[PDB]
Design a binder for this molecule. Structure first.
Ligand SMILES: *[C@@H]1O[C@H](CO)[C@@H](O[C@@H]2O[C@H](CO)[C@@H](O)[C@H](O)[C@H]2NC(C)=O)[C@H](O)[C@H]1NC(C)=O
Ligand SMILES: *[C@@H]1O[C@H](CO)[C@@H](O[C@@H]2O[C@H](CO)[C@@H](O)[C@H](O)[C@H]2NC(C)=O)[C@H](O)[C@H]1NC(C)=O
Ligand SMILES: *[C@@H]1O[C@H](CO)[C@@H](O)[C@H](O)[C@H]1NC(C)=O
Ligand SMILES: *[C@@H]1O[C@H](CO)[C@@H](O)[C@H](O)[C@H]1NC(C)=O
Lengths: 190, 188
Protein backbone atom coordinates (compact mmCIF):
# COMPACT_ATOMS: atom_id res chain seq x y z
CA UNK A 1 0.00 0.00 0.00
CA UNK A 2 2.51 2.60 -1.18
CA UNK A 3 0.56 5.79 -0.50
CA UNK A 4 2.45 8.60 -2.26
CA UNK A 5 -0.59 9.90 -4.20
CA UNK A 6 -2.80 9.58 -1.11
CA UNK A 7 -1.55 12.88 0.35
CA UNK A 8 -3.92 14.66 -2.00
CA UNK A 9 -6.81 12.56 -0.75
CA UNK A 10 -6.95 13.37 2.97
CA UNK A 11 -7.10 17.12 2.61
CA UNK A 12 -9.69 17.28 5.37
CA UNK A 13 -6.75 16.39 7.59
CA UNK A 14 -4.10 18.78 6.30
CA UNK A 15 -3.14 22.39 5.69
CA UNK A 16 -4.49 23.02 2.18
CA UNK A 17 -4.42 25.83 -0.37
CA UNK A 18 -6.38 26.13 -3.63
CA UNK A 19 -4.22 27.66 -6.33
CA UNK A 20 -6.76 27.67 -9.15
CA UNK A 21 -10.37 26.88 -10.06
CA UNK A 22 -11.23 25.93 -13.64
CA UNK A 23 -14.57 25.03 -15.17
CA UNK A 24 -14.04 21.28 -14.86
CA UNK A 25 -11.42 20.78 -12.14
CA UNK A 26 -9.54 22.32 -9.17
CA UNK A 27 -5.81 23.03 -8.68
CA UNK A 28 -4.63 22.85 -5.05
CA UNK A 29 -1.60 21.97 -2.97
CA UNK A 30 -1.41 20.46 0.51
CA UNK A 31 1.30 20.44 3.18
CA UNK A 32 2.40 17.51 5.31
CA UNK A 33 5.57 17.25 7.45
CA UNK A 34 6.93 20.34 5.68
CA UNK A 35 6.66 18.69 2.25
CA UNK A 36 4.40 20.35 -0.34
CA UNK A 37 2.29 18.22 -2.69
CA UNK A 38 0.54 19.55 -5.80
CA UNK A 39 -2.85 18.09 -6.77
CA UNK A 40 -5.48 18.40 -9.49
CA UNK A 41 -8.97 16.97 -9.00
CA UNK A 42 -12.37 16.85 -10.72
CA UNK A 43 -13.96 16.49 -7.28
CA UNK A 44 -14.77 19.36 -4.91
CA UNK A 45 -15.44 17.13 -1.90
CA UNK A 46 -13.51 17.84 1.30
CA UNK A 47 -11.89 21.07 0.12
CA UNK A 48 -14.20 23.37 2.05
CA UNK A 49 -11.60 24.38 4.63
CA UNK A 50 -8.83 25.01 2.07
CA UNK A 51 -7.78 28.59 1.53
CA UNK A 52 -9.31 30.18 -1.59
CA UNK A 53 -12.26 27.76 -1.39
CA UNK A 54 -14.71 30.65 -1.70
CA UNK A 55 -15.55 30.14 -5.37
CA UNK A 56 -15.35 26.36 -5.17
CA UNK A 57 -18.44 25.16 -7.08
CA UNK A 58 -20.90 22.60 -5.76
CA UNK A 59 -19.59 19.91 -8.06
CA UNK A 60 -17.63 19.62 -11.33
CA UNK A 61 -19.16 18.52 -14.61
CA UNK A 62 -17.58 15.24 -15.77
CA UNK A 63 -18.10 15.65 -19.53
CA UNK A 64 -15.16 14.71 -21.77
CA UNK A 65 -13.25 17.83 -22.85
CA UNK A 66 -9.92 18.43 -24.62
CA UNK A 67 -7.75 21.50 -25.22
CA UNK A 68 -8.53 23.84 -28.09
CA UNK A 69 -5.38 24.01 -30.20
CA UNK A 70 -6.51 26.04 -33.21
CA UNK A 71 -7.03 29.47 -31.73
CA UNK A 72 -9.41 30.74 -34.42
CA UNK A 73 -12.14 28.29 -33.50
CA UNK A 74 -11.97 29.31 -29.84
CA UNK A 75 -15.06 31.56 -30.01
CA UNK A 76 -17.04 28.78 -31.68
CA UNK A 77 -16.19 25.73 -29.57
CA UNK A 78 -15.13 27.02 -26.15
CA UNK A 79 -16.99 25.51 -23.17
CA UNK A 80 -14.68 26.78 -20.43
CA UNK A 81 -11.26 25.90 -19.08
CA UNK A 82 -9.56 22.94 -17.44
CA UNK A 83 -6.27 22.03 -15.75
CA UNK A 84 -3.86 19.64 -17.44
CA UNK A 85 -0.47 18.19 -16.60
CA UNK A 86 2.30 19.26 -18.94
CA UNK A 87 6.10 19.29 -19.17
CA UNK A 88 8.24 21.97 -17.52
CA UNK A 89 9.88 24.50 -19.83
CA UNK A 90 12.93 24.56 -17.56
CA UNK A 91 13.03 20.78 -16.97
CA UNK A 92 11.95 21.26 -13.35
CA UNK A 93 9.22 18.62 -13.55
CA UNK A 94 7.84 18.33 -10.01
CA UNK A 95 5.72 15.48 -8.52
CA UNK A 96 2.01 16.03 -8.91
CA UNK A 97 -1.14 13.93 -8.75
CA UNK A 98 -3.90 14.14 -11.36
CA UNK A 99 -7.31 12.61 -10.59
CA UNK A 100 -5.48 10.21 -8.27
CA UNK A 101 -2.79 9.42 -10.82
CA UNK A 102 0.83 10.03 -9.69
CA UNK A 103 2.97 11.86 -12.27
CA UNK A 104 5.76 14.34 -12.97
CA UNK A 105 5.19 17.63 -14.79
CA UNK A 106 3.63 21.03 -14.24
CA UNK A 107 0.17 22.55 -14.46
CA UNK A 108 -1.35 23.87 -17.67
CA UNK A 109 -4.63 25.85 -17.74
CA UNK A 110 -6.41 25.70 -21.08
CA UNK A 111 -9.61 26.68 -22.83
CA UNK A 112 -11.36 23.46 -23.78
CA UNK A 113 -13.91 22.09 -26.22
CA UNK A 114 -16.34 19.19 -25.95
CA UNK A 115 -15.11 15.83 -27.23
CA UNK A 116 -16.19 12.23 -27.66
CA UNK A 117 -18.74 10.35 -29.71
CA UNK A 118 -22.17 11.93 -30.05
CA UNK A 119 -24.80 11.06 -32.65
CA UNK A 120 -27.16 13.80 -33.82
CA UNK A 121 -30.42 13.13 -35.60
CA UNK A 122 -33.63 14.90 -36.43
CA UNK A 123 -36.60 13.34 -34.75
CA UNK A 124 -39.80 12.04 -36.31
CA UNK A 125 -41.63 12.30 -33.02
CA UNK A 126 -42.06 16.08 -32.63
CA UNK A 127 -40.79 18.71 -35.09
CA UNK A 128 -37.78 19.98 -37.12
CA UNK A 129 -36.78 21.92 -34.00
CA UNK A 130 -36.44 18.78 -31.91
CA UNK A 131 -33.21 16.75 -32.07
CA UNK A 132 -32.02 13.52 -30.54
CA UNK A 133 -28.50 13.19 -29.21
CA UNK A 134 -27.06 9.76 -28.36
CA UNK A 135 -23.67 8.57 -27.13
CA UNK A 136 -22.07 5.22 -26.33
CA UNK A 137 -19.94 6.80 -23.59
CA UNK A 138 -20.82 7.02 -19.90
CA UNK A 139 -21.13 10.80 -19.79
CA UNK A 140 -21.49 13.04 -22.82
CA UNK A 141 -21.92 16.81 -22.92
CA UNK A 142 -23.83 19.19 -25.16
CA UNK A 143 -24.14 22.95 -25.29
CA UNK A 144 -26.15 25.26 -27.48
CA UNK A 145 -24.04 28.30 -28.23
CA UNK A 146 -23.78 31.37 -30.40
CA UNK A 147 -20.10 32.12 -31.17
CA UNK A 148 -18.60 34.46 -28.59
CA UNK A 149 -21.14 33.78 -25.85
CA UNK A 150 -20.28 32.96 -22.25
CA UNK A 151 -22.58 30.02 -21.61
CA UNK A 152 -19.67 28.03 -20.23
CA UNK A 153 -21.48 26.74 -17.15
CA UNK A 154 -24.49 25.50 -19.13
CA UNK A 155 -22.90 22.26 -20.34
CA UNK A 156 -25.56 19.63 -20.00
CA UNK A 157 -24.42 16.09 -19.14
CA UNK A 158 -26.38 13.09 -20.41
CA UNK A 159 -26.00 9.32 -20.36
CA UNK A 160 -26.98 7.36 -23.45
CA UNK A 161 -29.70 9.56 -24.89
CA UNK A 162 -31.49 12.88 -24.60
CA UNK A 163 -33.97 14.99 -26.53
CA UNK A 164 -33.73 18.73 -27.19
CA UNK A 165 -36.36 21.11 -28.50
CA UNK A 166 -34.85 24.37 -29.67
CA UNK A 167 -36.21 27.59 -28.19
CA UNK A 168 -37.03 30.47 -30.51
CA UNK A 169 -33.99 32.55 -29.53
CA UNK A 170 -31.87 29.62 -30.71
CA UNK A 171 -33.61 29.49 -34.05
CA UNK A 172 -31.74 32.37 -35.61
CA UNK A 173 -28.91 31.51 -37.99
CA UNK A 174 -26.18 31.92 -35.40
CA UNK A 175 -26.66 29.19 -32.78
CA UNK A 176 -24.65 25.96 -32.94
CA UNK A 177 -25.42 22.70 -31.19
CA UNK A 178 -22.17 21.39 -29.79
CA UNK A 179 -22.15 17.76 -28.67
CA UNK A 180 -18.95 15.81 -28.09
CA UNK A 181 -16.61 16.57 -30.95
CA UNK A 182 -19.57 17.58 -33.15
CA UNK A 183 -20.93 20.94 -34.23
CA UNK A 184 -24.19 21.39 -36.06
CA UNK A 185 -25.80 24.59 -37.25
CA UNK A 186 -29.23 25.19 -35.75
CA UNK A 187 -31.63 26.24 -38.56
CA UNK A 188 -33.37 29.60 -38.77
CA UNK A 189 -37.07 29.41 -37.87
CA UNK A 190 -38.42 31.05 -41.04
CA UNK B 1 3.01 45.39 -34.22
CA UNK B 2 1.72 42.04 -32.93
CA UNK B 3 3.15 39.64 -35.54
CA UNK B 4 5.60 42.05 -37.18
CA UNK B 5 8.51 41.97 -34.71
CA UNK B 6 8.05 38.25 -34.47
CA UNK B 7 8.09 37.24 -38.13
CA UNK B 8 11.26 39.30 -38.09
CA UNK B 9 13.89 37.49 -36.05
CA UNK B 10 16.52 37.61 -38.81
CA UNK B 11 16.89 41.37 -38.32
CA UNK B 12 16.54 41.38 -34.53
CA UNK B 13 18.04 40.10 -31.29
CA UNK B 14 16.39 36.71 -31.06
CA UNK B 15 16.58 34.04 -28.33
CA UNK B 16 15.25 30.48 -28.46
CA UNK B 17 13.48 29.51 -25.24
CA UNK B 18 12.60 25.93 -26.17
CA UNK B 19 12.59 23.47 -29.06
CA UNK B 20 9.86 20.84 -29.19
CA UNK B 21 9.42 18.04 -31.70
CA UNK B 22 6.95 19.99 -33.79
CA UNK B 23 7.70 23.70 -33.16
CA UNK B 24 9.99 26.29 -31.59
CA UNK B 25 9.37 28.84 -28.84
CA UNK B 26 11.55 31.96 -28.95
CA UNK B 27 11.49 35.64 -28.10
CA UNK B 28 12.70 38.77 -29.86
CA UNK B 29 13.93 42.16 -28.71
CA UNK B 30 13.16 45.43 -30.49
CA UNK B 31 13.56 48.96 -29.14
CA UNK B 32 14.03 47.55 -25.64
CA UNK B 33 10.82 45.50 -25.47
CA UNK B 34 10.57 41.70 -25.61
CA UNK B 35 8.03 39.76 -27.70
CA UNK B 36 7.20 36.08 -27.19
CA UNK B 37 6.85 33.87 -30.24
CA UNK B 38 5.80 30.38 -31.30
CA UNK B 39 6.36 29.12 -34.82
CA UNK B 40 6.48 25.83 -36.70
CA UNK B 41 8.87 27.49 -39.13
CA UNK B 42 12.58 27.13 -38.46
CA UNK B 43 13.56 29.60 -41.14
CA UNK B 44 15.21 32.84 -40.09
CA UNK B 45 16.01 31.67 -36.58
CA UNK B 46 19.52 30.46 -37.35
CA UNK B 47 20.93 33.65 -35.76
CA UNK B 48 19.07 33.05 -32.49
CA UNK B 49 20.77 32.09 -29.25
CA UNK B 50 20.42 28.38 -28.40
CA UNK B 51 20.09 27.45 -32.04
CA UNK B 52 22.33 24.36 -32.05
CA UNK B 53 19.48 21.80 -32.18
CA UNK B 54 17.11 23.87 -34.29
CA UNK B 55 15.95 21.50 -37.05
CA UNK B 56 15.86 22.25 -40.76
CA UNK B 57 12.12 21.61 -40.94
CA UNK B 58 9.33 20.90 -38.49
CA UNK B 59 6.89 18.13 -39.36
CA UNK B 60 3.40 19.52 -39.77
CA UNK B 61 1.26 16.42 -39.27
CA UNK B 62 -1.71 17.22 -37.07
CA UNK B 63 -1.02 16.48 -33.42
CA UNK B 64 -2.99 17.16 -30.25
CA UNK B 65 -2.04 16.94 -26.53
CA UNK B 66 -2.44 13.64 -24.72
CA UNK B 67 -5.16 14.24 -22.13
CA UNK B 68 -5.24 10.81 -20.51
CA UNK B 69 -1.84 10.28 -18.92
CA UNK B 70 -2.30 6.52 -18.82
CA UNK B 71 -2.01 5.95 -22.56
CA UNK B 72 0.97 8.28 -22.95
CA UNK B 73 3.51 5.48 -23.60
CA UNK B 74 1.35 4.04 -26.36
CA UNK B 75 0.46 7.11 -28.39
CA UNK B 76 3.23 9.61 -27.69
CA UNK B 77 4.90 11.05 -30.80
CA UNK B 78 6.93 13.80 -29.16
CA UNK B 79 6.16 17.21 -27.71
CA UNK B 80 4.80 20.52 -29.00
CA UNK B 81 4.23 24.06 -27.75
CA UNK B 82 0.69 25.36 -27.25
CA UNK B 83 -0.91 28.55 -26.00
CA UNK B 84 -2.50 28.35 -22.57
CA UNK B 85 -3.86 30.64 -19.86
CA UNK B 86 -1.85 32.24 -17.06
CA UNK B 87 -2.48 30.44 -13.78
CA UNK B 88 -1.87 33.73 -11.96
CA UNK B 89 -4.09 35.79 -14.26
CA UNK B 90 -1.04 37.50 -15.84
CA UNK B 91 -1.62 36.85 -19.55
CA UNK B 92 1.06 38.32 -21.83
CA UNK B 93 0.89 38.88 -25.64
CA UNK B 94 2.22 35.99 -27.73
CA UNK B 95 2.35 35.26 -31.43
CA UNK B 96 1.44 31.69 -32.39
CA UNK B 97 2.24 30.84 -36.03
CA UNK B 98 1.78 34.51 -36.94
CA UNK B 99 -1.55 34.44 -35.07
CA UNK B 100 -1.30 37.09 -32.27
CA UNK B 101 -2.98 36.50 -28.85
CA UNK B 102 -2.66 36.90 -25.06
CA UNK B 103 -1.68 33.91 -22.98
CA UNK B 104 1.10 31.65 -21.70
CA UNK B 105 3.22 29.03 -23.44
CA UNK B 106 2.68 25.35 -22.61
CA UNK B 107 4.73 22.32 -23.54
CA UNK B 108 2.76 19.09 -23.81
CA UNK B 109 3.44 15.50 -24.75
CA UNK B 110 1.55 15.09 -28.00
CA UNK B 111 -0.19 12.40 -30.06
CA UNK B 112 -1.16 11.88 -33.70
CA UNK B 113 -4.54 13.23 -34.78
CA UNK B 114 -7.09 13.31 -37.60
CA UNK B 115 -8.89 10.79 -39.79
CA UNK B 116 -6.92 7.81 -41.04
CA UNK B 117 -8.18 4.40 -42.14
CA UNK B 118 -6.04 1.31 -41.87
CA UNK B 119 -7.08 -1.00 -44.67
CA UNK B 120 -4.88 -3.97 -45.39
CA UNK B 121 -4.80 -4.15 -49.15
CA UNK B 122 -4.17 -7.41 -51.00
CA UNK B 123 -0.50 -7.21 -52.01
CA UNK B 124 2.29 -9.72 -52.75
CA UNK B 125 4.39 -8.94 -49.67
CA UNK B 126 2.72 -10.17 -46.47
CA UNK B 127 4.17 -7.13 -44.73
CA UNK B 128 2.50 -4.31 -46.67
CA UNK B 129 -0.59 -2.36 -45.66
CA UNK B 130 -2.38 0.60 -47.25
CA UNK B 131 -3.50 3.61 -45.23
CA UNK B 132 -5.96 6.23 -46.40
CA UNK B 133 -6.74 9.71 -45.14
CA UNK B 134 -8.78 12.57 -46.64
CA UNK B 135 -6.88 15.37 -44.91
CA UNK B 136 -4.31 17.55 -46.70
CA UNK B 137 -1.54 15.97 -44.66
CA UNK B 138 -1.70 13.03 -42.29
CA UNK B 139 0.92 11.31 -40.18
CA UNK B 140 1.79 7.80 -39.14
CA UNK B 141 4.42 6.00 -37.10
CA UNK B 142 5.38 2.47 -36.17
CA UNK B 143 6.25 2.23 -32.49
CA UNK B 144 6.18 -0.18 -29.60
CA UNK B 145 4.81 1.28 -26.35
CA UNK B 146 7.63 3.17 -24.64
CA UNK B 147 9.88 3.37 -27.71
CA UNK B 148 11.57 6.79 -27.75
CA UNK B 149 10.81 7.33 -31.42
CA UNK B 150 10.27 10.99 -32.23
CA UNK B 151 11.11 12.46 -35.64
CA UNK B 152 10.33 9.02 -37.04
CA UNK B 153 6.83 10.16 -37.92
CA UNK B 154 6.01 10.12 -41.63
CA UNK B 155 3.95 12.64 -43.64
CA UNK B 156 1.51 11.48 -46.29
CA UNK B 157 -1.25 12.85 -48.49
CA UNK B 158 -4.33 10.99 -49.65
CA UNK B 159 -2.82 7.55 -49.22
CA UNK B 160 0.40 5.67 -48.52
CA UNK B 161 1.90 2.18 -48.72
CA UNK B 162 3.64 0.93 -45.62
CA UNK B 163 5.99 -1.98 -46.02
CA UNK B 164 6.60 -3.47 -42.55
CA UNK B 165 10.14 -4.42 -41.56
CA UNK B 166 10.97 -7.68 -39.81
CA UNK B 167 11.34 -6.44 -36.23
CA UNK B 168 7.88 -4.85 -36.42
CA UNK B 169 6.30 -8.29 -36.63
CA UNK B 170 6.66 -9.06 -32.94
CA UNK B 171 3.16 -8.61 -31.57
CA UNK B 172 4.25 -5.47 -29.74
CA UNK B 173 4.38 -2.76 -32.38
CA UNK B 174 1.40 -0.57 -33.20
CA UNK B 175 0.53 1.26 -36.38
CA UNK B 176 -0.33 4.76 -35.19
CA UNK B 177 -1.98 6.88 -37.85
CA UNK B 178 -4.18 9.88 -37.15
CA UNK B 179 -6.43 9.11 -34.22
CA UNK B 180 -6.18 5.40 -35.01
CA UNK B 181 -4.00 2.67 -33.54
CA UNK B 182 -3.64 -0.86 -34.85
CA UNK B 183 -1.59 -3.78 -33.54
CA UNK B 184 1.08 -5.27 -35.86
CA UNK B 185 0.50 -9.07 -35.68
CA UNK B 186 2.89 -11.93 -34.94
CA UNK B 187 3.66 -13.90 -38.12
CA UNK B 188 5.89 -16.91 -38.86
C1 LIG C 1 8.88 11.02 -11.27
O1 LIG C 1 10.26 11.31 -11.07
C2 LIG C 1 10.84 10.63 -9.95
C3 LIG C 1 12.26 11.12 -9.84
O2 LIG C 1 12.32 12.52 -9.57
C4 LIG C 1 10.74 9.11 -10.14
O3 LIG C 1 11.02 8.48 -8.88
C5 LIG C 1 12.31 7.86 -8.71
O4 LIG C 1 13.23 8.83 -8.21
C6 LIG C 1 14.52 8.27 -7.96
C7 LIG C 1 15.27 9.22 -7.05
O5 LIG C 1 15.34 8.70 -5.73
C8 LIG C 1 15.16 8.09 -9.32
O6 LIG C 1 16.51 7.64 -9.14
C9 LIG C 1 14.38 7.01 -10.05
O7 LIG C 1 14.86 6.87 -11.39
C10 LIG C 1 12.84 7.23 -10.05
N1 LIG C 1 12.20 5.93 -10.23
C11 LIG C 1 11.97 5.35 -11.41
C12 LIG C 1 11.34 3.98 -11.34
O8 LIG C 1 12.21 5.92 -12.49
C13 LIG C 1 9.32 8.67 -10.49
O9 LIG C 1 9.31 7.31 -10.90
C14 LIG C 1 8.72 9.54 -11.61
N2 LIG C 1 7.32 9.18 -11.83
C15 LIG C 1 6.37 9.25 -10.88
C16 LIG C 1 5.00 8.83 -11.31
O10 LIG C 1 6.60 9.65 -9.73
C1 LIG D 1 -5.18 41.07 -25.14
O1 LIG D 1 -4.41 41.53 -26.30
C2 LIG D 1 -4.79 42.85 -26.73
C3 LIG D 1 -4.03 43.13 -28.01
O2 LIG D 1 -4.59 44.24 -28.70
C4 LIG D 1 -4.49 43.84 -25.61
O3 LIG D 1 -4.91 45.13 -26.04
C5 LIG D 1 -3.83 46.10 -25.94
O4 LIG D 1 -2.50 45.49 -25.93
C6 LIG D 1 -1.44 46.45 -25.84
C7 LIG D 1 -0.14 45.68 -25.84
O5 LIG D 1 -0.21 44.51 -26.64
C8 LIG D 1 -1.59 47.34 -24.59
O6 LIG D 1 -0.58 48.34 -24.59
C9 LIG D 1 -2.97 47.98 -24.55
O7 LIG D 1 -3.12 48.70 -23.32
C10 LIG D 1 -4.03 46.89 -24.64
N1 LIG D 1 -5.39 47.42 -24.49
C11 LIG D 1 -6.15 47.94 -25.47
C12 LIG D 1 -7.51 48.40 -25.05
O8 LIG D 1 -5.75 48.07 -26.63
C13 LIG D 1 -5.25 43.47 -24.35
O9 LIG D 1 -4.88 44.31 -23.27
C14 LIG D 1 -4.95 42.02 -23.95
N2 LIG D 1 -5.75 41.64 -22.80
C15 LIG D 1 -7.10 41.57 -22.80
C16 LIG D 1 -7.74 41.18 -21.50
O10 LIG D 1 -7.78 41.81 -23.81
C1 LIG E 1 -7.79 10.04 4.04
O1 LIG E 1 -8.71 10.86 4.72
C2 LIG E 1 -9.99 10.87 4.04
C3 LIG E 1 -10.91 11.71 4.90
O2 LIG E 1 -10.68 13.11 4.75
C4 LIG E 1 -10.55 9.46 3.77
O3 LIG E 1 -11.53 9.59 2.75
C5 LIG E 1 -9.49 8.45 3.33
O4 LIG E 1 -10.00 7.12 3.42
C6 LIG E 1 -8.24 8.62 4.16
N1 LIG E 1 -7.19 7.70 3.72
C7 LIG E 1 -6.33 7.13 4.57
C8 LIG E 1 -5.31 6.21 3.97
O5 LIG E 1 -6.38 7.33 5.79
C1 LIG F 1 11.64 41.41 -41.79
O1 LIG F 1 13.02 41.44 -42.29
C2 LIG F 1 13.24 42.17 -43.50
C3 LIG F 1 14.64 41.85 -43.97
O2 LIG F 1 14.99 42.55 -45.16
C4 LIG F 1 13.06 43.64 -43.14
O3 LIG F 1 13.33 44.47 -44.27
C5 LIG F 1 11.67 43.91 -42.59
O4 LIG F 1 11.80 44.65 -41.38
C6 LIG F 1 10.82 42.62 -42.36
N1 LIG F 1 10.12 42.23 -43.56
C7 LIG F 1 8.95 41.56 -43.56
C8 LIG F 1 8.38 41.22 -44.92
O5 LIG F 1 8.37 41.26 -42.51
Amino acid sequence: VSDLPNNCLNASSLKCEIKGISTYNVYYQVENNGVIYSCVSDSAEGLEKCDNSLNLPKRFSKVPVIPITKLDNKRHFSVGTKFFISESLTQDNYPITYNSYPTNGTVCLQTVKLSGDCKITKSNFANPYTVSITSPEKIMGYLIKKPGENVEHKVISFSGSASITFTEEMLDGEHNLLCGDKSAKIPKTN
